[PDB]
Amino acid sequence: KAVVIDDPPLRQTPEPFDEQSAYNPQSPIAIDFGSSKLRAGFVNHATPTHIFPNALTKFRDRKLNKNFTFVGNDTLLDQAVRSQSRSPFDGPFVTNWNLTEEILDYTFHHLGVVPDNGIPNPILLTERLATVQSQRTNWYQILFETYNVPGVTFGIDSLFSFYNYNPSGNKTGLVISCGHEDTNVIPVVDGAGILTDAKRINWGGHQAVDYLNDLMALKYPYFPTKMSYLQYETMYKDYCYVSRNYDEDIEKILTLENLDTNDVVVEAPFTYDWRNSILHLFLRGPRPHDSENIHEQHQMHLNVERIRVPEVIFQPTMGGQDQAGICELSETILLKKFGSQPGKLSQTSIDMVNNVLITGGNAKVPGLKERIVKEFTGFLPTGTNITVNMSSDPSLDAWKGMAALARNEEQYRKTVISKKEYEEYGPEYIKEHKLGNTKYFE
Amino acid sequence: ERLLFLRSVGERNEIGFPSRFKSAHYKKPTRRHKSARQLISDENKRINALLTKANKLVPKATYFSVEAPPSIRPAKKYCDVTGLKGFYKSPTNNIRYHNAEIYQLIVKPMAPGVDQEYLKLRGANFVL
Amino acid sequence: LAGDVISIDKASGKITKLGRSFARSRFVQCPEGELQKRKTVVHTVSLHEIDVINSRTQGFLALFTGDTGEIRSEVRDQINTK
Amino acid sequence: KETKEVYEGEVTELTPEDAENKTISHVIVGLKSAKGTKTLRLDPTIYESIQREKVSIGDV
């Protein structure tokens, strides 16, 4: 078998800008303020019009007033402008406000919306679960006394995806979302998320790429070239899958017959027997090491532990967080809450088992659904029908969620927080609608 | 010669200091660059202030009640460098290793200051 | 105590003291590496021993005391079929 | 002709219900294998045999 090489750089988009001047002054605007991808579009369209990496930069250019290529896909023309392109999103919260104003101004330019006072359209926001009150007050500020939006409402994007795949609005289910920086498990009864019993794991997919960076740097402390973080996402989203059973795989993952098909070798760009030695199998794979070759110094020999990176959402103790995995959280939800005991299931628990949805940008790792359904049938009673639902692309289905909430008129008008209600009630106010957040107390 | 291409694509999205998506009474503030660390703790300060001013009130859904509890089953122990089963833990630097060859080639000749990263990946970095 | 070469069977919970190591202060050398090793044991058990074992009224002490006392034929047929 | 029925697996719950009339009424035992779990009601004789075998939570 001839050993192949894998160059990881990602290409540059040559056409960044596309917008239309014709627009509807009464149709609302649906935007998903994702940690990884900004999504933008109208209401009448089924698919989101604009997909962006939610990042912006401040390019300093001499003799042209030092302010160019600010927001969006314009950073994707050159690697130099994409290098310092600062996504303002921290772990839980975005950080800078003028940056987010520039994101909103750029995307409002990209629907061709003309001024009419501030903005003549209602907005459709996505809000993270258990949001800090200061964030929601400053969100109220940056809509109302910044853009003059008449209609604001926001909710959990996983609940939006559940409403998208269950448009009836009164179904019972369990949604397991894995976002860029956060994963959570939320039970929905009668269309209403019982956030009181929802749980959260602080891993997401950003910490998975950070874990791969830390692993592959600790494996090779003397690597010649600096491995870029974008290339870490690139070779994470390509060679990482979830095993069916993690316990019996790691005792097989470094055998000689398994290394022929499991191991893929990546190549970084530039310009005493080894068979009995399992350190040679771990470091240099099923091929003998040529220490004089300039390729083998740059050979980024991954895939020996490609199972370890996506498994950590089931065992968060390998990631450093002392939290029970989504398997244990689903077990506690389906076997200890809503009147259900270990041994007999309530009807709500059976309906929740019969409708399980997984979504998010980190859900497109292969082997997730089979592992989820095998682990679910591990602890559930025999004969209980388990249905796990998946999307073709589970990252942008939340946008279809607020689109489906926008098509429904009477379900739109329950959740609308207006300017007048904000003015009489102050910025400390939460509409306890079912498709979103709730009060901190009773 | 690709610099003028960059100014050409940048010569389409200027937003003036009076922005055209403004509410005509917009006054941008000088709010500080708040990090993601102290926001959790001053929410926590707000919650203790509210509960001490109320009890002299069970919370429904805050950022802390949403947190998943730690697991009740014992966690599987893994090798700190190879990722396989960790049968043994070295008594000196507290690294869990796989077998004899990893112990003699990695764990024993490990320099001081290299154990902290291996424990930090597991979340056991005791050095603060 | 400290300085003892021992052997532990994890499943049966049996600890055998192989002896004191080379500490000057019986004496047995320090064993080779790769702790928790698979050991292949080959047992040759005579058919009379399995006949004594399968006879529920006969313990294996009758293999040493000698009072097996006319093992029934049906036990031997079950042993032959097994 | 006879039947052989076997319950195999790991004990998840072992709750003895007393209902005195000191003496246990019954015991609820939850077994679990890779195809799922199953709950059984057992008389105190089988509970006596279970406590004979030093069976705790988590034992196949």
Curated annotation (Swiss-Prot), chain A:
There is a cross-link at residue 1 (Glycyl lysine isopeptide (Lys-Gly) (interchain with G-Cter in ubiquitin)). Its main location: nucleus. One of its GO terms (cellular component) is nucleus. The keyword Transcription regulation applies. It is found in: Nucleus. CDD domains: ASKHA_NBD_Arp5. The modification Phosphothreonine is found at residue 13. Pfam families: Actin. Keywords: Isopeptide bond, Nucleus, Phosphoprotein, Transcription, Transcription regulation, Ubl conjugation. InterPro entries: Actin (IPR004000), ATPase_NBD (IPR043129). The keyword Nucleus applies. GO terms for biological process: chromatin remodeling; DNA repair; regulation of DNA-templated transcription. Gene3D superfamilies: 3.30.420.40, Actin, Chain A, domain 4 (3.90.640.10). It comes from the Eukaryota. Transmembrane segments: none annotated. One of its GO terms (molecular function) is enzyme regulator activity. Present with 2170 molecules/cell in log phase SD medium. Component of the chromatin-remodeling INO80 complex, at least composed of ARP4, ARP5, ARP8, RVB1, RVB2, TAF14, NHP10, IES1, IES3, IES4, IES6, ACT1, IES2, IES5 and INO80. Probably involved in transcription regulation via its interaction with the INO80 complex, a chromatin remodeling complex. Belongs to the actin family. This is Actin-related protein 5. It comes from Saccharomyces cerevisiae (strain ATCC 204508 / S288c).
Curated annotation (Swiss-Prot), chain B:
GO terms for cellular component: Ino80 complex; nucleus. The keyword Transcription regulation applies. Keywords: Nucleus, Transcription, Transcription regulation. GO terms for biological process: chromatin remodeling; DNA repair; regulation of DNA-templated transcription. It is found in: Nucleus. Component of the chromatin-remodeling INO80 complex, at least composed of ARP4, ARP5, ARP8, RVB1, RVB2, TAF14, NHP10, IES1, IES3, IES4, IES6, ACT1, IES2, IES5 and INO80. Belongs to the IES6 family. Probably involved in transcription regulation via its interaction with the INO80 complex, a chromatin remodeling complex. Also involved in the regulation of telomere length. This is Chromatin-remodeling complex subunit IES6. The gene is IES6.
UniProtKB/Swiss-Prot annotation, chain C:
It is found in: Nucleus, Nucleoplasm. Present with 3030 molecules/cell in log phase SD medium. DNA helicase which participates in several chromatin remodeling complexes, including the SWR1 and the INO80 complexes. The SWR1 complex mediates the ATP-dependent exchange of histone H2A for the H2A variant HZT1 leading to transcriptional regulation of selected genes by chromatin remodeling. The INO80 complex remodels chromatin by shifting nucleosomes. Its ability to induce transcription of some phosphate-responsive genes is modulated by inositol polyphosphates. The INO80 complex is involved in DNA repair by associating to 'Ser-129' phosphorylated H2A histones as a response to DNA damage. Belongs to the RuvB family. Probably forms a homohexamer. Interacts with RVB1 and may form heterododecamers with RVB1. Component of the SWR1 chromatin remodeling complex composed of at least ACT1, ARP4, RVB1, RVB2, ARP6, YAF9, VPS71, VPS72, SWC3, SWC4, SWC5, SWC7 and SWR1, and perhaps BDF1. Component of the chromatin-remodeling INO80 complex, at least composed of ARP4, ARP5, ARP8, RVB1, RVB2, TAF14, NHP10, IES1, IES3, IES4, IES6, ACT1, IES2, IES5 and INO80. Also belongs to the R2TP complex composed of at least RVB1, RVB2, TAH1 and PIH1. Interacts with SPT15/TBP. The gene is RVB2.
Curated annotation (Swiss-Prot), chain D:
Probably forms a homohexamer. Interacts with RVB2 and may form heterododecamers with RVB2. Component of the SWR1 chromatin remodeling complex composed of at least ACT1, ARP4, RVB1, RVB2, ARP6, YAF9, VPS71, VPS72, SWC3, SWC4, SWC5, SWC7 and SWR1, and perhaps BDF1. Component of the chromatin-remodeling INO80 complex, at least composed of ARP4, ARP5, ARP8, RVB1, RVB2, TAF14, NHP10, IES1, IES3, IES4, IES6, ACT1, IES2, IES5 and INO80. Component of the R2TP complex composed of at least RVB1, RVB2, TAH1 and PIH1. Interacts with SPT15/TBP and HSP90. Belongs to the RuvB family. Present with 11600 molecules/cell in log phase SD medium. DNA helicase which participates in several chromatin remodeling complexes, including the SWR1 and the INO80 complexes. The SWR1 complex mediates the ATP-dependent exchange of histone H2A for the H2A variant HZT1 leading to transcriptional regulation of selected genes by chromatin remodeling. The INO80 complex remodels chromatin by shifting nucleosomes. Its ability to induce transcription of some phosphate-responsive genes is modulated by inositol polyphosphates. The INO80 complex is involved in DNA repair by associating to 'Ser-129' phosphorylated H2A histones as a response to DNA damage. Coiled coil: none annotated. The chain holds residues 134 to 199 of 463 of the full protein.
